[PDB]
Amino acid sequence: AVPPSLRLPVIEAAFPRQLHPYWPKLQETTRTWLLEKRLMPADKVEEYADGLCYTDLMAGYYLGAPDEVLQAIADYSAWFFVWDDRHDRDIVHGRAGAWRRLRGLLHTALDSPGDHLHHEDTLVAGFADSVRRLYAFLPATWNARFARHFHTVIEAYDREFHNRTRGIVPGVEEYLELRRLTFAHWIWTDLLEPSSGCELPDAVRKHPAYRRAALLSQEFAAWYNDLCSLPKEIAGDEVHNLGISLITHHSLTLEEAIGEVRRRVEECITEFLAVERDALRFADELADGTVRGKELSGAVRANVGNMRNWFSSVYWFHHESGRYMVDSWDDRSTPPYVN
Ligand SMILES: O=P(O)(O)C(O)(Cc1cccnc1)P(=O)(O)O
Ligand SMILES: [Mg+2]
Ligand SMILES: [Mg+2]
Numbered sequence: 001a002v003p004p005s006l007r008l009p010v011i012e013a014a015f016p017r018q019l020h021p022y023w024p025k026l027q028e029t030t031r032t033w034l035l036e037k038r039l040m041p042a043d044k045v046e047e048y049a050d051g052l053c054y055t056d057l058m059a060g061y062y063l064g065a066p067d068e069v070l071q072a073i074a075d076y077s078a079w080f081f082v083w084d085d086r087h088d089r090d091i092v093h094g095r096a097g098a099w100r101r102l103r104g105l106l107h108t109a110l111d112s113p114g115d116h117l118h119h120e121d122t123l124v125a126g127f128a129d130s131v132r133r134l135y136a137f138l139p140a141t142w143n144a145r146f147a148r149h150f151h152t153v154i155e156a157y158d159r160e161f162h163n164r165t166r167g168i169v170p171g172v173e174e175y176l177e178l179r180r181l182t183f184a185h186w187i188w189t190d191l192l193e194p195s196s197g198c199e200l201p202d203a204v205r206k207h208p209a210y211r212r213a214a215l216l217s218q219e220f221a222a223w224y225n226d227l228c229s230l231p232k233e234i235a236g237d238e239v240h241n242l243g244i245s246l247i248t249h250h251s252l253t254l255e256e257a258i259g260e261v262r263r264r265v266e267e268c269i270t271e272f273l274a275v276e277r278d279a280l281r282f283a284d285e286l287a288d289g290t291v292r293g294k295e296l297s298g299a300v301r302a303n304v305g306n307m308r309n310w311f312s313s314v315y316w317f318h319h320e321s322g323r324y325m326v327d328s329w330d331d332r333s334t335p336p337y338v339n
């Protein structure tokens with residue numbers, strides 16, 4: 001039972017969940033990875049890790065991925081989450097020096113992950129080992145594009161640190177541009193390609209049907225999270241949320257922004273359904289008769305399928321994960337799973 005303020009019938013009706021066959025071992029390896037990289041303490045991994053559903057989220061998205069591709073994707077996704085918790089914990093304690101060093105370590109490790117596998121900062125070491133495994137699957141042009149995209153993601157996070165510190169809530173349009181980057185839309189879009197085993201040429205992945213579907217996929221995920229994390233994020237003094245920009249810059253009620261947020265999420269789905277047909281026609285055009293044509297068609301059709309998979313994974317993730325159950329915490333401002 002999804003609460004009705006969050007219930008999306010088109011999702012439940014026409015985007016049935018899928019699950020990767022590797023998920024059971026995926027869940028365990030990542031929990032152990034979290035334990036051995038010391039990205040969380042012992043008792044909170046044992047208590048909270050499984051119930052945070054970070055492996056479920058990715059096992060429901062990257063269908064068809066090689067087990068070791070999925071495993072690296074899921075460690076980095078579990079890493080992405082704790083980096084968000086460390087980023088929010090630096091803000092809450094004005095650790096602007098620590099954030100800045102880490103932010104420069106992260107910028108550096110992203111280009112030379114091997115050189116950081118054993119860095120003193122555990123969070124930098126974990127990231128270096130997931131990114132290093134991420135870099136082994138495809139040519140260094142993919143690896144470079146991944147770095148270019150993550151370099152901008154870090155910078156977006158630095159813009160957030162200075163937004164929450166100086167009290168600035170972004171404007172709605174400033175937020176929609178920033179939210180593509182803090183959510184890391186293009187990271188997740190990049191990782192569609194090791195999951196289907198193929199770097200796409202610029203001409204394929206930048207076709208307007210591919211690009212618009214890839215975009216609407218992430219806009220839904222980012223904006224459904226805003227709808228669903230809004231209570232947690234208000235209680236944690238967070239200001240980066242479409243709901244929050246609409247309240248402070250368009251003088252909307254709490255209940256009015258939530259409907260405008262819900263309404264914008266809903267149109268993401270119906271717009272995706274349209275361009276999905278364009279993107280799938282494009283996949284079939286790519287099968288011109290040649291070998292590389294057949295492969296490029298299959299890779300586009302798998303990635304587009306996983307663009308569709310993202311909706312249901314994200315949707316059910318936000319009702320199953322303990323990360324958003326602010327109502328079950330003794331302290332509504334400090335999630336019990338962060339340090
Ligand atoms: O779980 P959260 O904190 O609501 C979030 O989605 C965490 C997150 C960060 C980056 C990518 N995906 C999720 P955020 O971006 O802070 O809104
Ligand atoms: Mg967050
Ligand atoms: Mg965040």
Ligand SMILES: [Mg+2]
Binds near residue numbers: 225226229233
């Ligand atoms: Mg959020």
